[model samples]
Target: MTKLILIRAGETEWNLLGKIQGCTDIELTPNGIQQANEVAQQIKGNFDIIYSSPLHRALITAQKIAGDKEVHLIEGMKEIPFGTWEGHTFEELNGDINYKKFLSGEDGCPFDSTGMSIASWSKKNAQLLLDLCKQNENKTIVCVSHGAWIKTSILGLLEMEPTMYHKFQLGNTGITTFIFRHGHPVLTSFNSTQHLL
Candidate 1:
């Protein structure tokens, strides 16, 4: 079985500010940089290969964890784009009726500008995981990505519906583990952030 360890990248200003950051090029804050370093040390020697979303926030975390190991980038692993809503604060967005409806998980609620409905995003993440497991069987691999992307992937793997998306949350450097079983990822552990203590 391929052990898949999904790592949420360290914090950026947008994260602390509670702003929408899908596909935004926000760098980790200074404390975020320190957290990345600490997490890198905590996870060192635990995995065989490394990968990350192309976004600098994720890529930088991957690089820190990689050390001498090469870190590969996957386009499909990038955070789902928020499109026109990329930089708004959550408080700002909550005022809109449409955002409220979307959060309510209303049936047929339209997605944001990127056009990646939850189903589509889920499918893409599943495919990406299948491909990775296929190409790297019986190995441990780390993939650093954003919070929403990681959450969606896990829910998809578990055959959960989009409405459950609001129920999951992940913190910076939190670790979620899955093992490839019969060509599917089976969750083992989720969002363990003890090292952040």
Candidate 2:
């Protein structure tokens, strides 16, 4: 079994405004930086492998947490893009029917206007988990990602309905852990944030 821990990046300017930050790169706010620093010092324990999304919001926290450890960037780990909905506030999307579907976690909720479904995104994320598990067998790994991205990824890996994504809330620096045994993901923890204390 491989111990895999996933972390959500700290707060961003968009987070405070209730805006959708999908794929559009944004830096963490000052408070987000402080949270990152705290997590760096109050981390649960050391990890053997550290990985992060290349986006600044995510890499910033990963860089601070990794300390002297090498931080690796993995492809397909970036936050999913929201197509035309990028950087829009929740209220700004008021009359969008697709947006409503997304909020309701309904099937066929197109995250992209180009016709990509949420389930497709989840499946891809779940596949990423499989790849990571294969590469890091018997090792402990920590990875940083965006909030929506991490939520979908977890739902994907656990073979849960993608519509249930919002049920898992990962706060800034919260850590979710899992163990992949014989290629099956067993959730060990769900959004544990004792470090926030």
Candidate 3:
């Protein structure tokens, strides 16, 4: 079986401020670093390879967890772009009808309602992850990425619609495990934060 662990990058200043950080390169907060260290301790396996989003927040967290292991950065693993909403908070967009509709789970991109198609964007990124898994069969791989991408990919693996994006809540440093057998991905865990306790 090819085992893969998906770890969401730690918290950031924008994360704490409730600002949209999609595709924004933000550094992790001190507490976020601690959380990464905690999860690193709980990870009890020999990872044959480590992959991370190109963003600093994710790269830093991956480095922490990797120890002496080298981390490979993948552009496709980056977070979804929020476009105009990149630096704004939900409260700031409260008066916008489209934004409200998206938050209510409407079939549209809440962060980029006027820009790229969210569903398509998610599928592309999800395909990147799936391809990575297919290429690294019979190995333990660790991928450190952003919350939205990780959530979207998980839903994709389950053959669920990307519209159900809000259903998965990935915390900072939360780990999700998947086992690939016969070219199929089976989720073994979701949003596990036991190490944070």
Candidate 4:
């Protein structure tokens, strides 16, 4: 069986500020570093390959958890592009009236423009990861990415809707595990952060 270990990078400055990071590259907060350290100490496994988003936050967290392992940075794992609303906090966008509704998956807020819809983006990324897994069916892989990307990836694996994706709340440094047998993904665990305490 091929095992896929997904780790969502910890909280960032934008995350603490309640801003939409989307594809914006934000640095990790001090607390995020602590969270990563805690996660590194808690997770137990031997991974043959390590992957992460191009964003610094995810890359840094992946590096810390990797210890002495080799790391491979993949742009395919970056967060969903938020388009024009990249750095704005929730309160800042509240005046626009539709911000809250959109974020809640009401009117597909982020997709009002020609930008990629959450569902499509997630599906594409998930497929890419699945292909990678298929290529290395006997390998243990660790992928560190953003919350939205990770959520979408899990949804793809479970064949669920994007609306239910966020229901799998992934805290900073949270880990989700899956076992792939005969090209089918079996969820072993989701949103586990026992080490973050």
True-vs-predicted CA distance for residue 29, candidate 3, Å: 1.0
Candidate 1, residue 57: CA error in Å? 0.9
lDDT of 2: 0.82
- The TM-score that candidate 3 achieves is 0.90
Per-residue lDDT of 75 in model 3: 88
- Candidate closer to the true structure by lDDT (higher is better), 1 or 4: 1
lDDT of 4: 0.79
lDDT of each: 0.82, 0.82, 0.82, 0.79
What lDDT tens digits, residue by residue, belong to model 2 across residues 1-197?
A: 47888898888988898888888888999999998888888764488888999999899999989998888997588888888888788678879888888767665566747476668878888888778867888888888998877888888888887678756767888888899666688889888877774
What TM-score would you give candidate 4 relative to the actual structure? Answer: 0.87
20-111 per-residue lDDT for model 4 (tens digits)? 78887889899999988888787644788888898999998988888888778888888877666677765666655445545677644343
Cα lDDT tens digits for candidate 3, 35-134: 9888888875368999999898899889888898899999889887877778998788867866765656565455565455446656666688778877
Question: TM-score of each candidate?
Answer: 0.92, 0.92, 0.90, 0.87
Q: Taking the tens digit of each residue's C-alpha lDDT, what string does model 1 give over 1-197?
A: 58999999999999988888998889999877787887898887688889999999999989999999999999989998877678887677766655665587654233465656666677678778878877888889899999879988887788777777778888998899998666666899888888775
Query: Clashing residue pairs in candidate 1, if any?
Result: none
Candidate ordering by TM-score (highest first): 1, 2, 3, 4
